[PDB]
Design an enzyme around this catalytic site. Sequence first.
Site, mmCIF file in Angstrom:
data_model
loop_
_atom_site.group_PDB
_atom_site.id
_atom_site.type_symbol
_atom_site.label_atom_id
_atom_site.label_comp_id
_atom_site.label_asym_id
_atom_site.label_seq_id
_atom_site.Cartn_x
_atom_site.Cartn_y
_atom_site.Cartn_z
ATOM 1 N N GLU B 58 14.142 62.249 -33.630
ATOM 2 C CA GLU B 58 13.799 61.060 -32.841
ATOM 3 C C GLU B 58 13.009 60.050 -33.670
ATOM 4 O O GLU B 58 13.278 58.849 -33.576
ATOM 5 C CB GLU B 58 13.026 61.448 -31.577
ATOM 6 C CG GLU B 58 12.897 60.289 -30.600
ATOM 7 C CD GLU B 58 11.815 60.455 -29.559
ATOM 8 O OE1 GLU B 58 10.750 61.037 -29.865
ATOM 9 O OE2 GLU B 58 12.047 59.972 -28.431
ATOM 10 N N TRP B 80 17.454 61.986 -24.952
ATOM 11 C CA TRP B 80 17.717 60.638 -24.477
ATOM 12 C C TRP B 80 19.036 60.497 -23.729
ATOM 13 O O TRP B 80 19.323 59.423 -23.183
ATOM 14 C CB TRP B 80 17.707 59.669 -25.685
ATOM 15 C CG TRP B 80 16.306 59.271 -26.067
ATOM 16 C CD1 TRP B 80 15.548 59.773 -27.079
ATOM 17 C CD2 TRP B 80 15.516 58.256 -25.433
ATOM 18 N NE1 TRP B 80 14.333 59.136 -27.113
ATOM 19 C CE2 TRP B 80 14.284 58.213 -26.100
ATOM 20 C CE3 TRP B 80 15.717 57.422 -24.326
ATOM 21 C CZ2 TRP B 80 13.259 57.343 -25.733
ATOM 22 C CZ3 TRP B 80 14.712 56.551 -23.960
ATOM 23 C CH2 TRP B 80 13.494 56.520 -24.659
ATOM 24 N N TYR B 94 12.118 51.270 -27.951
ATOM 25 C CA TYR B 94 11.287 51.535 -29.113
ATOM 26 C C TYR B 94 11.740 51.053 -30.474
ATOM 27 O O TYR B 94 11.136 50.131 -31.042
ATOM 28 C CB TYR B 94 11.077 53.065 -29.209
ATOM 29 C CG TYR B 94 10.380 53.670 -28.014
ATOM 30 C CD1 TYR B 94 9.002 53.516 -27.827
ATOM 31 C CD2 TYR B 94 11.079 54.441 -27.100
ATOM 32 C CE1 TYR B 94 8.376 54.075 -26.725
ATOM 33 C CE2 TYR B 94 10.448 55.033 -26.022
ATOM 34 C CZ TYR B 94 9.096 54.845 -25.844
ATOM 35 O OH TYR B 94 8.460 55.460 -24.786
ATOM 36 N N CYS B 146 6.826 54.012 -23.074
ATOM 37 C CA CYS B 146 5.732 54.844 -22.556
ATOM 38 C C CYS B 146 4.643 54.956 -23.609
ATOM 39 O O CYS B 146 3.472 54.654 -23.339
ATOM 40 C CB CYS B 146 6.266 56.199 -22.108
ATOM 41 S SG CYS B 146 7.391 56.019 -20.698
ATOM 42 N N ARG B 166 0.880 54.212 -21.980
ATOM 43 C CA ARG B 166 0.798 53.723 -20.612
ATOM 44 C C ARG B 166 1.318 54.681 -19.561
ATOM 45 O O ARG B 166 0.842 54.634 -18.421
ATOM 46 C CB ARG B 166 1.487 52.351 -20.531
ATOM 47 C CG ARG B 166 2.982 52.295 -20.730
ATOM 48 C CD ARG B 166 3.717 52.437 -19.400
ATOM 49 N NE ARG B 166 5.173 52.554 -19.576
ATOM 50 C CZ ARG B 166 6.004 52.781 -18.563
ATOM 51 N NH1 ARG B 166 5.542 52.903 -17.325
ATOM 52 N NH2 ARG B 166 7.322 52.902 -18.741
ATOM 53 N N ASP B 169 3.971 61.968 -19.425
ATOM 54 C CA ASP B 169 4.418 63.190 -18.739
ATOM 55 C C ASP B 169 3.678 64.300 -19.490
ATOM 56 O O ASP B 169 4.059 64.594 -20.622
ATOM 57 C CB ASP B 169 5.936 63.298 -18.878
ATOM 58 C CG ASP B 169 6.482 64.630 -18.374
ATOM 59 O OD1 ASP B 169 5.711 65.592 -18.226
ATOM 60 O OD2 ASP B 169 7.702 64.757 -18.132
HETATM 61 O O1 LIG Z 1 6.122 58.849 -18.787
HETATM 62 C C1 LIG Z 1 6.762 59.718 -18.169
HETATM 63 O O2 LIG Z 1 6.498 60.120 -17.017
HETATM 64 C C2 LIG Z 1 7.984 60.333 -18.884
HETATM 65 C C3 LIG Z 1 8.985 59.196 -19.184
HETATM 66 N N1 LIG Z 1 10.041 59.680 -20.074
HETATM 67 C C4 LIG Z 1 10.123 59.700 -21.414
HETATM 68 O O3 LIG Z 1 9.302 59.093 -22.116
HETATM 69 C C5 LIG Z 1 11.275 60.448 -22.165
HETATM 70 C C6 LIG Z 1 12.530 59.587 -22.457
HETATM 71 C C7 LIG Z 1 13.224 60.443 -23.531
HETATM 72 C C8 LIG Z 1 12.064 60.844 -24.459
HETATM 73 N N2 LIG Z 1 10.928 60.925 -23.526
HETATM 74 S S1 LIG Z 1 9.743 62.151 -23.731
HETATM 75 O O4 LIG Z 1 8.975 61.909 -25.079
HETATM 76 O O5 LIG Z 1 8.804 62.054 -22.473
HETATM 77 C C9 LIG Z 1 10.415 63.772 -23.687
HETATM 78 C C10 LIG Z 1 10.139 64.662 -24.717
HETATM 79 C C11 LIG Z 1 10.648 65.952 -24.588
HETATM 80 C C12 LIG Z 1 11.387 66.300 -23.452
HETATM 81 C C13 LIG Z 1 11.981 67.688 -23.299
HETATM 82 O O6 LIG Z 1 12.878 67.882 -22.466
HETATM 83 N N3 LIG Z 1 11.623 68.626 -24.193
HETATM 84 C C14 LIG Z 1 12.237 70.003 -24.069
HETATM 85 C C15 LIG Z 1 13.185 70.343 -25.242
HETATM 86 C C16 LIG Z 1 13.638 69.153 -26.113
HETATM 87 C C17 LIG Z 1 14.000 69.676 -27.510
HETATM 88 O O7 LIG Z 1 13.243 70.472 -28.108
HETATM 89 O O8 LIG Z 1 15.061 69.296 -28.039
HETATM 90 C C18 LIG Z 1 10.987 70.950 -23.995
HETATM 91 O O9 LIG Z 1 11.140 72.067 -23.499
HETATM 92 O O10 LIG Z 1 9.934 70.490 -24.483
HETATM 93 C C19 LIG Z 1 11.641 65.361 -22.429
HETATM 94 C C20 LIG Z 1 11.134 64.077 -22.547
#
Ligand SMILES: O=C(O)CCNC(=O)[C@H]1CCCN1S(=O)(=O)c1ccc(C(=O)N[C@@H](CCC(=O)O)C(=O)O)cc1
Lengths: 261, 262
Positions: B58, B80, B94, B146, B166, B169
């Site tokens: 990423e 994504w 981004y 985010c 901002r 999760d």
């Molecule tokens: O701000 C908010 O409420 C969230 C908005 N939503 C987001 O910002 C989402 C959009 C996509 C990337 N992010 S993230 O950085 O939050 C993200 C990072 C990891 C996961 C995830 O699914 N990780 C899995 C395995 C992934 C892997 O290892 O390939 C895990 O088990 O950790 C999901 C989202």
Amino acid sequence: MKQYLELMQKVLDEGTQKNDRTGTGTLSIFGHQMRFNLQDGFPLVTTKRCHLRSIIHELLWFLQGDTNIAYLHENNVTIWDEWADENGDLGPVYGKQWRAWPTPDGRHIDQITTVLNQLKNDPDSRRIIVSAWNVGELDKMALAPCHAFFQFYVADGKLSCQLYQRSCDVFLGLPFNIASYALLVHMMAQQCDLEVGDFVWTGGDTHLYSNHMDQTHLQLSREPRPLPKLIIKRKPESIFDYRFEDFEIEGYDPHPGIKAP
Amino acid sequence: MKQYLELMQKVLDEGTQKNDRTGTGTLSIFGHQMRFNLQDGFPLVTTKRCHLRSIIHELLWFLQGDTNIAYLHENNVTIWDEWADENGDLGPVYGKQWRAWPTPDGRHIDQITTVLNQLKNDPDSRRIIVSAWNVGELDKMALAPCHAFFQFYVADGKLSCQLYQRSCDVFLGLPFNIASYALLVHMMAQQCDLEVGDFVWTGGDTHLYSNHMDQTHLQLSREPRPLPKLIIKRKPESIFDYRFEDFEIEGYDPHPGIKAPV
Ligand SMILES: O=C(O)CCNC(=O)[C@H]1CCCN1S(=O)(=O)c1ccc(C(=O)N[C@@H](CCC(=O)O)C(=O)O)cc1
Ligand SMILES: O=C(O)CCNC(=O)[C@H]1CCCN1S(=O)(=O)c1ccc(C(=O)N[C@@H](CCC(=O)O)C(=O)O)cc1
């Protein structure tokens, strides 16, 4: 204020010696956060008298989207004088970005209007934000935004706000900056029928200038007093209709003002 | 990590029960700050197995200015995928803002190149900043930023970075976000001949999704293990020329992975 004085002391104790663009020294730290519960009192520094008059006029001027110092001049506010050009212009600083951020197609975005509608229609939104950090206009500005990005948040009927301040002059600017955003929360809360929550202050490069050291030492020898209470005497039609006379501070009992170069 | 588990506990202790945009409840707090001294070790959560593979891909993608999932999809990084349109596009999220923020007069600003030049030539600058919060293009994006705004700082030969996030999760996103910016600090420090300082993380709306609560309490029953170590094997000619194989993580001995719904 307790948190303010702890920050001053932390800069003194842990700040590293730096030489800014003017050749003036500073002691600086990176990354700090303070929280002010606005129901505990208006966060106006009591360890030195702060003049709310200039704070209020500057904020009203930001909200009009004005970047010419004429209005500040009409009211004897001189804090922006040295940045202005011969015509009194500052370029597209703070206010212009708040009210009319320019897009490439020639349109403008009114972030304040957006925030007010988000607070009224979608209060749980996670993106109730105003950014003055318009990368494409930084070169046109007299000063790149120091109090650069802020976010609002609503919980249990209370409005909070967090500011990201990328550059902070602890002695001279900070007292002003805290009061300014605290005032804005009170104004937004009134317009949206909310109570006041917290003002969260987050700092990036946070420094004390070398020529503010005597003043800082004097200020740190003083004990803080209970915070004043902000009173809004009139509820205007919108957030853009406030006037200087609408605000009164009650119970303000500061130590004498402290002048700094 | 201690800081991370403390944040989870703070959200649980002080958070307000609300509803996210889709209704999926959240518990949230507003305003938080924590710091990771990168000389202590690479801040990759150890209380659940995290895969650095996806985080690296990423970040390389962001640095290229890419906004299509093809590169990620090709490398089996699917985080994504759900956000993309039928052609794989996310809009100017981004990477696009980092590498080519469009100005009103028709220019494009490469904020990453700008920050690298500021670190090399004016490291005490108070405005070594990258903003993805392009107000004019937010509604063209599949997801508004985010991890939205970040600033660098140099003291005593060490590079620090503060991120303003901002929306966070805490369970699923945060472990990734912290590792991503810590990796970026290492890369930038290497390019500027600096050592690593601190990664400072500041949150805005910081929440635990209601369907991550049992996973969160499971994670909080575990003790953090020693931080892993990051080894970068090459010094590319620019910050945009790193490859996946240049990064190696050592001493990573995490507790078992914990799956959770997005
Ligand atoms: O701000 C908010 O409420 C969230 C908005 N939503 C987001 O910002 C989402 C959009 C996509 C990337 N992010 S993230 O950085 O939050 C993200 C990072 C990891 C996961 C995830 O699914 N990780 C899995 C395995 C992934 C892997 O290892 O390939 C895990 O088990 O950790 C999901 C989202
Ligand atoms: O980031 C940095 O290092 C600084 C960037 N410099 C700035 O950001 C300047 C540009 C003008 C506004 N600010 S400020 O918010 O920092 C500021 C605030 C107050 C003063 C000041 O001079 N206050 C007087 C009284 C004025 C009054 O109330 O009428 C005082 O003694 O408090 C100066 C600057």
